[PDB]
Amino acid sequence: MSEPIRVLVTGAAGQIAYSLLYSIGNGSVFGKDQPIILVLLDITPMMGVLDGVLMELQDCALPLLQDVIATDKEEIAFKDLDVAVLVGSMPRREGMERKDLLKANVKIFKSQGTALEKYAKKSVKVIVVGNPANTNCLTASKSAPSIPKENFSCLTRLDHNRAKSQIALKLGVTADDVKNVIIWGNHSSTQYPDVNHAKVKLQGKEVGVYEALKDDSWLKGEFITTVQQRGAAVIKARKLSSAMSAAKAIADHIRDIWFGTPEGEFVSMGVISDGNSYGVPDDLLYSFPVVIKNKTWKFVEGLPINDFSREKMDLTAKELTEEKETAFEFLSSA
């Protein structure tokens, strides 16, 4: 048997984590022959909830699960990790200023990054989910300089999947028919969904979404607006967060990291802008279209950028830059 891996989930009492854990344990992430050790970290009050979760997991009798560890201690939780999924973050409260939200998250992710640096394996893979995902991920990475920055990624797969869903709905097709969608930039309302290089399978033939839909107007205006606002719509209707789809997206993201992307297909990921050929500033966490082999990602080069795309990309890069500046003021003062 393959040696068990240690996987950490932070904020494990939160609904996204709760949804995710079963997908983690059942082999959908790491495959049906990888034993897992699962590590759950939360604040002390949640431990009661966390204990209830641990029990329910043990009740699921998942064959690939050979431990569940619940702790409020970073030194325990971050010990010898193989994979860390950072879902826990402070949610923005009413009347909380954006700067205070940033400071609080910077504190949390600085602490977690230092714990990774000290306790975790240097090969650890780190996935950041808690908003603001890009800036939090950057803060963590700066706090874990010994770990290769490529190990650190933030969840943009949710936007990619949403975009694919919207395209498939418009064409009337499965999600599988759609390929090579791109999300550029921040996981925020400023995120840019790009289908200029996306392909779809229609009438047994593969065709490019611009050609297939032939509605550039609707692709620019309505598709983008729908994707950007999809989460707010879901919360407005349910009165509850998008836990199910977030969990799905996280699972997909990790699974593509672990297996790699299919040949001739690329995926969108939030990743450190250093060395991009697209002229995004270095030292940013930006979202790019990427191919993954041997648990290593690479950037899909040579894609032409029209001025519409370029403008969106620079707008979101500006947003990310401002966020970075604000967070780094606290990181240096902290």
Partner: protein, 459 residues
């Protein structure tokens, strides 16, 4: 980049000649872009009148022609029927159409045939269709969110299934189910093709091929147990009738939840006799809880524990039988190679803990349902469906809730939980298991409870 649209009647001569001119321009000119539209002439009047009203144009003859200012389907600027577009092209470009009137007649036929092709293509798309039909009752419920991703996994059926899914509750629940549908679409599963809500009586289960029945959130106040039982009867009757009428004759109906599951199943079967053989109650969650309790006592993993049997009311009085329960990978120094197993009863030296404490613990777990969360419910339902299609693991016992036809002794006409295997798309009852006989007292208790529930519900 200039952008134009022209709309046609399939018979219109001048629209066809416009198409010729358009293709000439777009081929030769780098600048030129055009999109193409045509309607059946009967539709044309309405379609164009709508377009003209939206624009506040005033054109009626086919073709109609306009330049769209930024992107396909923007606002338009209107050019006139064919002569005006030809005039524009001739003066601005210098171009001339050269097509004969006779040719225009022929192409008018060709475009008639083209519209006939379009119609047949519409019909052709209807032919291509072979989905699996799924329905969910009481869908507006927290369990439903966890369940849907397991369905979408496809492992339930194999990753080769066109899935069509349906979700029911009242319109207020329909709002949150709308949100659920939105998340479902976002889940972008490869096997997902459709999902739907229902709220209305005639529609339900129509050509349903899989039916999932959850607990209800009874929005009514805390009625007495007798009133709760009776309150189920109208709902079970309605569902049974709807299923029997609307569903596919081979529909599979699975009943899951924390309350009165056996009773609900029994009532449904009574109202839906024909399908009743198809209807089963999920016991697996209780078995999982029992396994986990055992594993905690032993300090092993539940997965090592096997062949727990649940004997009773799943959601009520049940007996957990460990006589066949096996443990694997345990560290008895009387240690076998991989796949050796030891008997749980033999290993647990504390018979008092088994008899008093373990039983009391399970009784608490069942009565409270507290630990029966969304994850466990979903896992149980999904895994049961998986075994139903695929089969259960070879040799392994499963527990399932199923209608008694006398098999051990059990009185007929009740739904009981009992040990089972799944094979060839169907379950069999392991009546050949030795020693698994029940005591007369235990059987009397278990059946008597179910009978009393049934009687009270019928009133």
């Amino acid at each position: 980049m200039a952008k134009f649209v022209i709309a046609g009647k399939a018979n219109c001569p001048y629209y066809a000649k416009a198409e010729l001119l358009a293709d000439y321009l777009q081929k030769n000119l780098p600048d030129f872009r055009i999109f193409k539209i045509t309607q059946h002439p009967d539709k044309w009047e309405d379609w164009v009148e709508d377009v003209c009203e939206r624009n506040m144009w005033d054109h009626r003859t086919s073709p109609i022609i306009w330049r769209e200012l930024l992107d396909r389907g923007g606002r338009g600027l209107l050019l006139g029927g064919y002569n005006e577009f030809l005039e524009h092209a001739q003066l601005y470009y210098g171009v001339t159409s050269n097509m004969t009137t006779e040719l225009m007649m022929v192409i008018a036929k060709e475009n008639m045939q083209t519209h006939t092709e379009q119609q047949l293509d519409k019909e052709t798309m209807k032919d291509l269709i072979s989905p699996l039909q799924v329905w969910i009752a009481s869908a507006g419920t927290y369990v439903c969110c966890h369940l849907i991703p397991l369905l979408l996994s496809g492992e339930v059926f194999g990753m080769h299934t066109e899935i069509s899914l349906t979700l029911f509750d009242q319109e207020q629940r329909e709002d949150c189910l709308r949100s659920i549908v939105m998340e479902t679409q976002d889940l972008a599963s490869p096997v997902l093709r459709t999902v739907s809500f229902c709220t209305t009586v005639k529609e339900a289960f129509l050509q349903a091929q899989v039916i999932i029945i959850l607990d209800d959130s009874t929005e009514e106040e805390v009625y007495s147990l007798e009133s709760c039982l009776r309150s189920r009867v109208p709902l079970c009757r309605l569902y049974g009738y709807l299923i029997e009428k609307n569903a596919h004759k081979s529909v599979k109906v699975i009943v899951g939840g924390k309350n009165f599951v056996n009773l609900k199943t029994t009532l449904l079967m009574q109202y839906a006799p024909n399908i009743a053989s198809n209807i089963i109650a999920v016991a697996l969650g209780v078995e999982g809880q029992a396994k986990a309790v055992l594993a905690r006592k032993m300090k092993t993993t539940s997965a090592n524990i096997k062949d727990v049997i649940i004997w009773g009311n799943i959601t009520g009085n049940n007996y957990v039988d460990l006589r066949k329960a096996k443990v694997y990978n345990y560290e008895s120094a009387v240690k076998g190679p991989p796949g050796h197993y030891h008997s749980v009863l033999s290993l647990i030296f504390d018979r008092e803990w088994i008899t008093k404490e373990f039983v009391q613990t399970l009784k608490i777990l069942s009565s409270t349902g507290k630990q029966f969360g969304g994850i466990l419910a979903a896992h149980s339902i999904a895994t049961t469906l998986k075994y139903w299609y695929h089969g259960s693991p070879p040799g392994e016992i499963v527990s399932l809730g199923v209608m008694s036809e006398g098999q051990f002794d059990i009185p007929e006409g009740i739904v009981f939980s009992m040990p089972v295997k799944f094979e060839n798309g169907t379950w069999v009852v392991l009546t050949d298991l030795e020693d698994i006989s029940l005591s007369e007292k235990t059987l009397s208790r278990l059946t008597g409870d179910l009978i009393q529930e049934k009687l009270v519900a019928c009133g």
